[PDB]
Structure 1
Amino acid sequence: PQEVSDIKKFIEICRRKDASSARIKKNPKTQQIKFKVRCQRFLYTLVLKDSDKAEKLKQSLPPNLQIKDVPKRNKR
């Protein structure tokens, strides 16, 4: 697990030759948006508190990879 303070370098990570997967979790209780991406060695997390930079960012990341919002209660 590794942090990313800003937004610019986060897309730089996602725009890499081995970024295989990504996902998006939203917490209603604490009003938070977490962007998680899975590279070869580490798992990078970006935390946001806003509500509109969330969706607009999602169109900025490359189109080739996929994004699945995590569903509450996930079965084996």
Structure 2
Amino acid sequence: PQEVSDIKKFIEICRRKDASSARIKKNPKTQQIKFKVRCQRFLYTLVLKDSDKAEKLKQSLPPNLQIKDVPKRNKR
């Protein structure tokens, strides 16, 4: 797993061809939001403060990329 600290790098990673899926994790106790994109080798995580602009980053993400919110319980 790798942490991406730059929005431009994260957008390029999400525009890569092997980007199979992406998910959004919300941690309200720490007031943070994580964008995780699954590629062939690595899972890339961008960590942001929970904010409206962080919500609008989803619209700048590519539309063909499937994006899902993480539920509160990981059911098997």
Shorter-chain TM range is over 0.9
Number of equivalences: 76
Percentage of pairs with the same residue: 100
What RMSD, in angstroms, separates the aligned Cα atoms of the two structures? 0.9
Q: CA deviation at 1:26?
A: 0.4
> Aligned partners of 1:72, 1:40: CA distance in 2, in Å?
26
CA shift digits 1:9-49 (9 cap, x unpaired): 10000001110010000011110000000000000000001
After TM superposition, where is structure 1 displaced by more than 6 Å over at least 4 residues in a row?
none
- Equivalent in the alignment of 1:46: 46
TM-score, scaled to structure 2: 0.94
Q: CA deviation at 1:72?
A: 0.7
Give ranges in structure 1 of 5+ residues lacking alignment: none
> Aligned partners of 1:45, 1:7: CA distance in 2, in Å?
11
> Aligned partners of 2:36, 2:4: CA distance in 1, in Å?
10
Seen in structure 2, the aligned counterparts of structure 1 residues 19 and 52 have a Cα distance that, compared at 3 Å, is same
Give ranges in structure 2 of 5+ residues lacking alignment: none
